């Protein structure tokens, strides 16, 4: 994936008024650069190897370019085989609007829910194409929108096992697992609510809580396919800790790309107000 | 050249603000934060002959404190800083201006949206209890007609809703309310009677700690609010 | 064996089915895809816990077998199970829109659905056995079939009817169970001697060059045909007891979705093409080694040659892929490209067939060849960076096969 | 609460014994060691309006020392601790009494086998020389016919026979012999003179330093002997 931007600035970015013109120019540059250069860079290797003829040759399969007139990065590089690009033309299949080619990140990883998957892919598009303030605004918008989202999807799926080992008279014991801790808190809260108890081997959605809740613990867990009891649903919802979950499900990735793209994911310094 | 003890104190405060320092010719000292969040400027009685960039201002001040107050500091023949005392001569190499964040001009402060007064003891109490109460944010706002400052722990509550330590600044007679947020790792004032000048239009907004010896300017995190 | 143990080499093919098929036909063969019976299967089992294919403890209540030449969706339903008896499926009700109580099965599908209910498991399983007998599939596929379908059906017929009826699946009465699936050693595969099991999940996984977050049938079906199914509620385990109607209709669209994918990809046409181009049994498509052995043997036999005995070597892993080092930096203008058939092209660069080795030469540091500072390893004989040396005028048999296949691909693109 | 500087110093010295505290509503302060090896009591003049549990004492006292002594301390609306200065307030969190380990019942000392008295400079000498001389245990005994102290190095001398510090505590008119063994770290007390109440029975024994402001009680390890 050779990175060639010098030719663009060398020719003069002002010459190009549309993304299509830049794409066409760099396509002609690739056409004039590939065949002679690759032929000369392989004929010496062919005579070194002493074969009948060098079949070995590349092409100009893929291109990528940040949209013209915008301040997006275009393409960054988070880790080995973990990156994103804004491809305009795959193997002479031109796209009227650029298509994002993404891999490595959690956009395709099913450990996180699907809503945050859409949110990550949209954020990736924004950073690649739009620019900084767009990502800041989208951050703030989603951050506002995440709090009132339904508690079912934003609850972590866990497996409830060997509960009796980690309980101490209905209270957390030694090395109580986080999901098991939430199950114990649920059992304490639903003590006298007439609900079916959580069974070993069942699946539970876990909603963590902030320190100091009346339940006296940092998490709760409720059985698979069911809802929180109406009596304690409001008390839980008013006391849930979505902050650390949001960061784990959405903030984590931006940190990597922005640190690897010369980008910031939230700003709290001026640099403007002064000189 | 010759520097007074108060001048060296201002240089040490600027070193706390930023490791490096620009010393242009004149009677003014100026240095901005590495990230540019804070800016410290002051006017000194002494004059300066030549501009110089110092990477290690604190170490240079430590060296300077060991010699007479009347030692002369000038440009050495080897491209460095020469300090001549009555009996001793010190060679401190001069740092490159490009390797240290360099200010250009002091900011002509516009009309302040709010004017407030703070005393030395109250500010010292604020900064001292900030470490003990692990406070990282302070919100300056209006509560029952009183312009006040309040402490907020950002880490445990990003919503900035947990009051931990509130200090009342003074009276505020106006319906133009505001909540301006400061990060504790920015302001580094010297003790003294200081005045706050707060300016804001839309997203734009900054604060100014003006004092008898030096004046500093600090930024506002975007979640600051203001209706004027 | 006897010429092996005296320390002498025997040339030709140890395998004999390939020899028989190559000798019997010889010339290139033609075929009509319509004549070969391609069967599709899918099964739904209601269970308290995840139905485990290896143990097969739960009961089968849903079997949809799609026959190609008869072009029929045979549906086997179990009415009176141990999970409470249920009503009988209705075609016209299912064809209707879901709001009145239907399941939105396309009408042409119900035009071919041959539905049969059964009061007890033994009768339904025996009917499935005799349906297999009357219309023996020639290639028996489905989505994730060797993982959940084939094992479950065969374990259940063994645990209910006995091995004497379990072995009735094959036309030659031989159903041998292979145990390994050495990747994690988790599951077991089955082999019915006479029908070529070909898991459609593996066919898609290997012959698509596509990556998806999940390879479950639903997501890939949505990707391919843009046709999901109506959302449902509750765990699947209780569906049979809530609205069993939808249950059966659910499975009926399940088998079709796969057929839809076939109609978009033509995968079974591909498997027929490869099998009849390599003159080899169907299941060998799963293994590239068998395919290549078959084609190279057929070509060499056409050239009046003999293949050597399969030499026994130990496993010596070699260094993997040269992965470049990425600097975590944003690159705005980045032109990316990869050459075509890198390894196949190199195969003609060094002509590496077993007879083409010609010795070794003086080995320089690899960086010397990277910078080109090393001199010419040989002038009249070809050079490779591994210190080894190969002929230039004697074309290898492997390069000849590469040339033939590449010419065929170019001709067929034309 | 309006507290005096002397009370702050006394309860600072108390904080060494236990990190937390349970200031019950009343007039009497009382702490026990976390391992239950040393108890400390005192009576003050500032009445306690409500019970409060404090986890980190040292930070709380650091905050207290940086405000006016007339700042009124009470319980906030959320059950926390609100201390209001003349023009400021501080919200120190209040812990649950369950998590903070505190002694349950006020402790009386029944009777001493031989009541003695120790002068301030004696304990001061002992405490400054314990760290320098690498001493890990001490013994109060009768030698020559008088009650004396003896410093021992258990680390090297497992027999605790190598005396390093000796000082005749006083006279001894009796027939009971004793060798009470205590670790200097176990005994933490304010600089000052004290009255020793020393009692014993079977395997179990007591030493007590009664003071003019606060009283301490330390235990005696199993190596202690007492013949009556």
Residue numbers in the entry:
A (entry chain C): 623 to 897
B (entry chain B), D (entry chain D): 1 to 228
C (entry chain C): 71 to 484
Authors' description from the paper:
In state 2, both thumb domains align at equivalent heights. DNA interaction is restricted to the left polymerase, where thumb residues Arg-704, Phe-796, Lys-797, and Arg-803 engage the substrate, while the right polymerase maintains no DNA contacts. The primer 3′-end occupies neither catalytic site of the left polymerase. In state 2, the DNA occupies the central region of the clamp channel, maintaining proximity to all three Arg-131 residues from each clamp monomer. In both states 1 and 2, the DNA substrate remains displaced from the polymerization active site in either polymerase, with the primer 3′ terminus positioned 16 Å away from the catalytic residue Asp-620 and the finger domain maintaining an open conformation. During the transition from state 3 to state 2, the duplex region of the DNA moves toward the clamp’s central channel and becomes less severely tilted. This shift causes the primer/template DNA to disengage from the left polymerase and move 14 Å toward the right polymerase. Superposition of the right polymerases of states 2 and 3 illuminates the structural rearrangements required to reposition the DNA primer from its inactive placement in the left polymerase of state 2 to the catalytically competent configuration observed in state 3. This alignment reveals four coordinated transitions: (i) further upward tilting of the sliding clamp relative to the DNA; (ii) downward compression of the polymerase thumb for improved DNA engagement; consequently, (iii) P/T DNA rotation that shifts the template strand laterally by 16 Å to optimize interactions with the thumb; and (iv) finger domain closure to stabilize the incoming nucleotide.
